Every structure is written in C-alpha cells, then in structure tokens.
Design a protein around this ligand. Structure first.
Ligand SMILES: [Zn+2]
Lengths: 38, 144, 59, 176, 207
RNA sequence: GCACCUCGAUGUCGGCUCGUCGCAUCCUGGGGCUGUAGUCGGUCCCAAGGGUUGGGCUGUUCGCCCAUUAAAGCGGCACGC
RNA sequence: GAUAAACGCUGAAAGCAUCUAAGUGUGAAGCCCACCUCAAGAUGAGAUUUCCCAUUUCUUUAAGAAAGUAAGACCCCUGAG
C-alpha cells in the first residue's frame, strides 16, 4: 500500500472505491498504485 | 410551621410491577424504572422515606442498542493497582451477564444511603420467568 | 408541592403543567400549597378541578 | 436497475414454495433455501417469475439487483452446477484423491490435506489439473480460494496454483 | 483424576537399572476412605471427599463422628476434595490404595511451604544491597517508595511481612517405585513441605 | 520570552536501591510494495506482551574506544527518588 | 473464541467492474480463556454434610426480662513442623 493523506489516480485504470470510512485506489495495471487515506 | 404530609416510615404501601424489555433501548427503560423507584408518580413524597415500589425486569437479552454502540460503548474499570484498566466489556454484556447491564440504572439514582436502599428493589432477570410469582406482580405498558 | 401536583396530575391524564394554563384560563387561583394538600387528600375535589381544567383548554 | 428488472426464466424441474420469508427451490439436484426482506414480492405467470417492489426510498435499487442475481445463481445451481478448475505448474507437484482427502505435494515437507463439505466433490483427471464442482457459487468459491492460498503463484517463474485463466505477470529479474 | 494424599518422610538416593544416582523423596499413605460423593443435582458440581489418618476417639466431636459414620471408619484428620474426575466407579467408603500410580510418572505435587518469621526485604524478593563501604550508610534497606507527583504510594511495593506458609505446586515430576506392602511412593526431585505434613499427589494437568 | 508562583529560609547534576507509564518501535510477532532470482535488504501499515551487556578514559551531562549480544529504543514521572 | 493491519467468496447500487451496504470467511508474542495463587465484610454477607430440643417473673404477653444447662468453645499447663 501507500498510506497518504492525499490520494489521486495515477494511470488510466485507477478507480476510486470507498470500502469503509476510507478511500481506495485499485489498479490491475500495476500493483504499485494501491492507495489509502491515512 | 403548618400542614404538609411528612409521611412516616411505616405508612407507605408498596407494590410489585413487571416491565418487559423486548426491543426498547437502555436509556428509556432506565429512565422510567429509575423514576419509579424513588416513589415518584405518587402524591406522597418525602425526600426521606422510601416510598418507592418494586421493579422486576424481564427479557434483558433483547434490549436495543440503537445504530452502533454494539461494539462501541466500552465500559471501564480500574482496580487500584498500577497498569490496571480493564476495558474487558463492550456491548458483549447483552449476551453474558445481561443482568449486569444493574449499572445503567445504578447511575441514574442518587448516591446517598437511599440510592443504596432503592437500588435493592431491582430484580433483573435475563430470561422470561419470575422466581417471585408468590407476591402477585402487575404489568406496566410503556408508551413512554 | 410542584412534584406532588405533577404526580397527582399525571394520575388524571393531564400533564404536569397544563393544569396551570388550564386553571388560569378558567380563572382559578389556588396556592400550590393548597393544591398539594387537596391532591393528597381530596381525590374527588382534585378530579373536579382537573376536569374543569380539561374543560377550559378544550377549545 | 437494469438487472433489477430482468426476467428469471425457470427451466423444467423448478418447484418453489413460500414460507413466511422463506423461498425454497427444489429441483433435479438441490434444495437451496434462504430468507429475504419484506420489501420484495414474488410473482406468478408460469415459469418466468419476476420481482416488483414498493419504491419511493433513497436506495430503490440495491436489493433489486442483489435478489435477481442471487436467484439466478439459485436456479442455475439447482439446474446445472458450477465448475472452477485449477492447475499445478512448478513441475514436481501432484494432486491425489482417496475419497475426500486432497493431497498436494507442492514442495513443502508435507502432503497437505484438504477435506470437503457435503455437496462438493474433487475430480482429478491428471496429476496437474483439479476441478471443483457443486451447487452454490459461494461454497465453491471459498473452497477454491482455500486451495489457491496453499501456494499462490510467483512473478519469476510462475509456480503454484492458478485459475484456468489468470493473468500472472512475470518480472524477469536477473541472476543477481 | 488419580489422587492420593499422604505424609513427607525425607530424602534418599537410588541407583536405577543403568546405574545413575537419582535424588528421591519418600511419601507415605494408608487405606484411603471416600467420605461423600457430590453431584450436580445437590451441589452443582462433581467431587469426592477423601481423608488420611486415624485420630484417637478422644480427639473428635459428635458432628465429626456423625459425618464419618456412613463409611464405618475411625475419625480421620485431613479431609479434602478432588475435582475434574469422571465419577462412575466410586462407592461411598472405598479405599484408593497406592496401586493407582504405578505408571503415572507425570505428577503435580502440591505441598505447603515452611515458615521463617519476619525477615528482611531482601530474603523475600532478592533485592540487592547497597555498598558496604566508601562512606555509605545504606547497607540493607528496601529502596525508595516511588516518585513525588502522585502524593501517595502505589500498591505492590514489597516490604517486610512473613516468609512462607502458603501452598505451592510443582509440575511434571516422575515416579520411581510403588511399594504397596509398605505404602510408599518414591518421587524424583524436591517437595515443598516440612516433615509430617500433607502432600497431595495427582496426575498432572499439562499431559 | 513574560514575571502569576514559593525569600519568618523549598539542595546542584551524575551514580547506588527501587520502579512506573506513553509510543513517534531497538529485538522478537503479523503484513503491503520493490530498481524483491536465493541468502540478505530498502520503505511503509498493525502491534507496548516481555527483554534491552560487561569494561577502559573524564567529577559529567556529553562523548570516543575494547569485547560481546536477538537487540544494546526515545521520552514523561519537581531534567523520577 | 472474538479481533488489528492485510487477503479474499458471492453480489448490486452503476446491464460491466467491485472484499460491502444485505450475506458469509482466513487472519498475530496482542484481547478473553486455558497455567499458579488469594478470594462470600461478594452488608446482594452464598452452598452442602453432620450434631443439640424447653425453668421463674409477669412486665401484660411484646421479636419482655432473669437464671441453670445441651452440642461445643475458652481460661490454665507441657511444647514445635
Ligand atoms: Zn493505475
């Protein structure tokens, strides 16, 4: 993961998902773009 | 000096009530039950004499906790030793010791020597049955 | 005397304050000491007063 | 709700009860049962039964799609069943069945046993490929995923267990 | 499950059959009378009373001789219980002889310790000294009572107060012999207890 | 920095004895990414349960050095007593 | 046994996708047990086994006083594990 307070897409395939009181960025394009807010 | 009834210790007749707890939250059960045990809703106060009643509480396993607080109202105890907080409980006490959830009414009363007498008129049973059927209790509806 | 009036007023369905508004519309002005003694002893007279206070604010 | 209003075509061998909130489905293989919310309503008009609901909420739309997709899973699982076949690359890895005991020689010093619940079998045609069958999708998915977690693949040669069609990436790192 | 009380005699040595020296304690026993059987229907749990010695008849009471009298023995001193046993198999008034621990070999020994009076704060807890020279005056003291800020003293700051008198188990010891004709179990190692005291011997909990 | 506070009198920092708490974690425990072949590693997330060495030179807070160890944590408690 | 970070299964809102809102799991020396000890002054003072069964005064019979006893304990004496 990368846990940052600020979260943006990185690629064309980044999709923003809320799972709990949180914001995700999930990519099948790379595993390098996993992102948390925290 | 004039005329108001300062009631005496052996004049007040007491009663026995049954109060269900099927899907009512903690605050409002405890509110009505704690207003009962001081002898309110009777015109014969003193602020001395135990003019209260007797409350029996049935189905303590089925008390609502609204929204969250199921995993959240962490109670706390400390035991006078260093490093001694024990936050063991949660909303777990609905399952184990549903009698103990005898804290949210023990808070609601004064902490005199009448808030220790009037606490010993609760009989909170987690199941659905009296052992006290020999004393002929009555039922209270709650639209309160 | 307010607490005793509240108890014996809730015994007749009236809330703890609407006796006051109801009696002051019906022009009845008892001290609350005497309402306390009647609310303890004279249940018939207290129900009479409570029914006139029901009668006043039933407009 | 373009899934919340698609028609559920029941083939031959569909027997449906209504018991309070229970909606039980019999048929040629299975007897799957659940419960649902009172905000849903069944239908008649033989064997294509759809759902229409009390609307005018904020949601309007979630439970529709979930109940239609879950009953299509119900009806397909009673009719046909489901297959999620796995493989074994990383040459020297085996899979053997004595009844309901999987033995997986995936390179440990063990082996690895895997038991089974009732409605799931394990078919082993050859020493690589393993097939999982049954009625539900959830049960089959959990068992297949528990098989995958024994040795999931690697990005360097690609050993372990896959799907039939995973896309396992290969990072060709040097020899140092 | 298996349980025999008894006494404490002393310390010996034993060559085993390979020829090695082993330190060995000596525990006696007697006939071993079961006094009551406690059931869930009357007591809420399951246990067995047991007691080992023979008083004279001068040294008991009419309640004690009424309590013993459903087993037809002399009044007995050291009455205790045993939990965690699946009953069956136990009449009122049997004898649980020394035969039970032939190949038990893994045993918890629960004595009661000695007593040593008032002693210092070192001998209870192993707190070290201060220096005995270079001008000091702090030879054998119990330290400092804590910090300044809380305006009190915390609990468990250990000080003087009598050594010994409390009961102590020791886990996982071995059994060497069972001498039925002399009523003696031999145990490797070290048992907490003064002589002539009680010792309970059980099959160990930790397998 | 200011001067509310203690001048009919409140002792300075190290060391000895004795500890206790916080987590922005030194080791052990569970994970995610890698410019991760292996053995090693780099970074980040969870986590306070226990443990954290003897010496040489300085009055020493600092420090440097020898030999070990899984590791030789940072701080508060009147810069603890 | 329930969790943390993390990993999923099924599934829509959003005809796809998606660990999540409905539903259902894996998951650490950490939490609660399991191991040892204290523990009914736990004034909410718990439970079981065994032992012991009646004079005078009337005060006006009330949970009255007074007196010799039963089961049993103590005073005193020889002592130490
Ligand atoms: Zn991307």
């Amino acid at each position: 993961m990368k846990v940052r307070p600020s979260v943006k897409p990185m690629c064309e395939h980044c999709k923003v998902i809320r799972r709990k009181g949180r914001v995700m960025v999930i990519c099948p394009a790379n595993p390098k773009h996993k992102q948390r807010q925290g | 000096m004039r005329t108001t009834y300062m009631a005496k210790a052996g004049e007040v007749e007491r009663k026995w009530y049954v109060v269900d707890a099927t899907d009512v939250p903690l605050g409002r059960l405890s509110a009505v039950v704690a207003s009962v045990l001081r002898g309110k809703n009777k015109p014969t106060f003193t602020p001395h004499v135990d003019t209260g009643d007797f409350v029996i509480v049935i189905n303590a396993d089925k008390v609502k906790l609204t929204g969250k607080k199921a995993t959240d109202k962490i109670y706390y105890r400390h035991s006078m030793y260093p490093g001694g907080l024990k936050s063991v409980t949660a909303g777990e006490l609905r399952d184990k010791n549903s009698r103990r959830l005898e804290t949210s009414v023990k808070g609601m009363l004064p902490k005199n020597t009448l808030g220790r007498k009037q606490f010993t008129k609760l009989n909170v049973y987690g199941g659905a049955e009296h052992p006290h059927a020999a004393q002929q209790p009555e039922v209270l509806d709650i639209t309160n | 005397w307010i607490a005793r009036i509240n108890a014996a007023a809730r015994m007749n369905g009236l809330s703890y304050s609407k006796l006051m508004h109801g009696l002051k519309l019906a022009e009845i002005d008892i001290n609350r000491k005497m309402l306390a003694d009647l609310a303890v002893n004279d249940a018939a007279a207290f129900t009479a007063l409570a029914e006139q206070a029901k009668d006043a604010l039933s407009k | 709700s373009r899934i919340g209003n698609k028609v559920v075509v029941l083939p031959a061998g569909v027997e449906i009860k209504q018991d309070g909130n229970n909606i039980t489905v019999k048929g040629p293989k299975g007897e799957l049962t659940r419960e649902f919310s009172s905000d849903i309503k069944m239908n008649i008009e033989g064997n294509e039964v759809t759902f229409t609901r009390p609307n005018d909420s904020k949601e309007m739309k979630t439970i529709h799609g979930t109940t239609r997709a879950n009953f299509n899973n119900m009806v397909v699982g009673v009719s046909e069943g489901f297959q999620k076949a796995l493989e074994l690359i990383g040459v020297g890895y085996r899979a053997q069945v004595q009844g309901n005991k999987l033995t997986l020689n995936v390179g440990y010093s063990h082996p690895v046993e895997m038991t089974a619940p009732e409605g799931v079998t394990f078919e082993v045609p050859a020493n690589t490929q393993v097939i999982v069958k049954g009625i539900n999708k959830e049960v089959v998915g959990e068992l297949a995923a528990n098989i995958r977690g024994v040795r999931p693949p690697e990005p360097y040669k690609g050993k372990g267990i896959r799907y039939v069609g995973e896309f396992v990436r290969r990072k060709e790192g040097k020899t140092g | 499950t298996k349980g025999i009380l008894g006494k404490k005699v002393g310390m010996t040595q034993i060559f085993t059959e390979s020829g090695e020296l082993i330190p060995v304690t000596v525990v006696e026993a007697t006939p071993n009378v079961v006094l009551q059987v406690k059931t869930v229907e009357t007591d809420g749990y399951e246990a067995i009373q047991v007691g080992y010695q023979d008083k004279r008849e001068v040294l008991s009471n009419k309640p004690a001789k009424g309590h013993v009298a459903k087993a037809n023995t002399a009044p007995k001193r050291f009455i205790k219980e045993f939990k965690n046993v699946e009953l069956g198999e136990y009449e009122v008034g049997k004898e649980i002889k020394v035969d039970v621990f032939q190949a038990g070999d893994v045993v918890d020994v629960t004595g009661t310790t000695k007593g040593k009076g008032f002693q210092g704060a070192i001998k209870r807890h192993g707190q070290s000294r201060g220096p005995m020279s270079h001008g000091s005056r702090y030879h054998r003291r119990p330290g400092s009572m804590g910090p300044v800020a809380p305006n009190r003293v915390f609990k468990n700051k250990r000080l003087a107060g009598r050594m010994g008198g409390d009961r102590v188990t020791i886990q996982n010891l071995e059994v060497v012999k069972v001498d039925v004709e002399r009523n003696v179990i031999l145990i490797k190692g070290n048992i907490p207890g003064a002589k002539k005291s009680l010792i309970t011997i059980k099959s160990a909990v930790k397998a």
